[PDB]
Enzyme design. Sequence first.
Site, mmCIF file in Angstrom:
data_model
loop_
_atom_site.group_PDB
_atom_site.id
_atom_site.type_symbol
_atom_site.label_atom_id
_atom_site.label_comp_id
_atom_site.label_asym_id
_atom_site.label_seq_id
_atom_site.Cartn_x
_atom_site.Cartn_y
_atom_site.Cartn_z
ATOM 1 N N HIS A 14 -29.937 43.165 -15.284
ATOM 2 C CA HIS A 14 -29.809 44.080 -14.146
ATOM 3 C C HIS A 14 -29.094 45.383 -14.537
ATOM 4 O O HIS A 14 -28.062 45.746 -13.986
ATOM 5 C CB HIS A 14 -29.111 43.375 -12.973
ATOM 6 N N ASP A 66 -30.223 48.187 -7.415
ATOM 7 C CA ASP A 66 -29.336 47.199 -8.045
ATOM 8 C C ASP A 66 -28.008 47.802 -8.508
ATOM 9 O O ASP A 66 -27.353 47.244 -9.391
ATOM 10 C CB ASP A 66 -30.017 46.534 -9.250
#
Length: 330
Positions: free
Chosen positions: A83, A124
Amino acid sequence: TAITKVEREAVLVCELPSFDVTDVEFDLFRARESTDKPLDVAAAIAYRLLLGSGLPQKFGCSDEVLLNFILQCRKKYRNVPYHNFYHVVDVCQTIHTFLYRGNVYEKLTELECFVLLITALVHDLDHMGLNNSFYLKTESPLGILSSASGNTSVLEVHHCNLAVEILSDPESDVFGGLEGAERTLAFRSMIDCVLATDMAKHGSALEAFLASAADQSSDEAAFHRMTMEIILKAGDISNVTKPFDISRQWAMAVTEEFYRQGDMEKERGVEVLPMFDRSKNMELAKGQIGFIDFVAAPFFQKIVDACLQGMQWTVDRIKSNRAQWERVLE
Ligand SMILES: COc1ccc(C(=O)Nc2c(Cl)cncc2Cl)cc1OC1CCCC1
Ligand SMILES: [Mg+2]
Ligand SMILES: [Zn+2]
């Protein structure tokens, strides 16, 4: 903290020779290895995608504000295995292919397309490589607030907070050229989309999309908003739709991030699900085939058959990749 001219220039010098960032076979991993400044190459890719779309120009977003925005986003991604900034640039690129190669742009306004490409890059922000369950299991201070205020989407609320923070600076406000109902819609749709990326909402998200698609005329606004949510979700789970060698490299990265969570759970003495347990020792293919069978194949087949016919290649590639994972198992 303001973006500097020198930071902008290091992005602007990347010319991306031999790459077509609009193609469904584009290889972000090859792009990263192509120079010793992969964070700059990734930012240039995002920049070229947004400008190439023609959208920021139409909504009063200057080249410089766009690039500042991309760089402010980049600063808030961490050095985690999956991520990170490369994942969200990937999601941005992938959504561009769904919109323009898959012709999903026909279903959406230009503003909604612009919002989707921007929202890919924020969705994110400041991910630490731990999922919502970790924060809840551990009663982390960092997720007590969420449960106390009526939402379990600890990460996604956090990403939205930070997106709003970035956009509050006129120097990086990509929505700064909007006014009234358009500015309001940009913020509302961005936040709706980010909140919809919580996989705890996956089933209801998919089923709400399929319902609105089966009857678009009855409520156009709802169909537009759900289509945006489902396309950001699609981009987010698109790793299994890529050429196999690309797909395999994403799978390695996700797995390492999961294993690091599992190792922290063992340190804390809390529960480790098998998917997060480094000690079970792989194999990569088993996890991918499972994720394909139970999650990714039914998601893409349903949204393609329901509405998004132009994205048929995603179903085809998932099928192909599954067969290849089966061969890797010998
Ligand atoms: C590349 O393969 C994968 C890609 C993405 C995901 C996944 O769950 N992504 C995701 C996550 Cl981890 C959190 N919120 C939303 C999404 Cl879409 C999960 C993947 O496979 C996992 C690792 C073993 C089985 C599942
Ligand atoms: Mg997320
Ligand atoms: Zn994501």
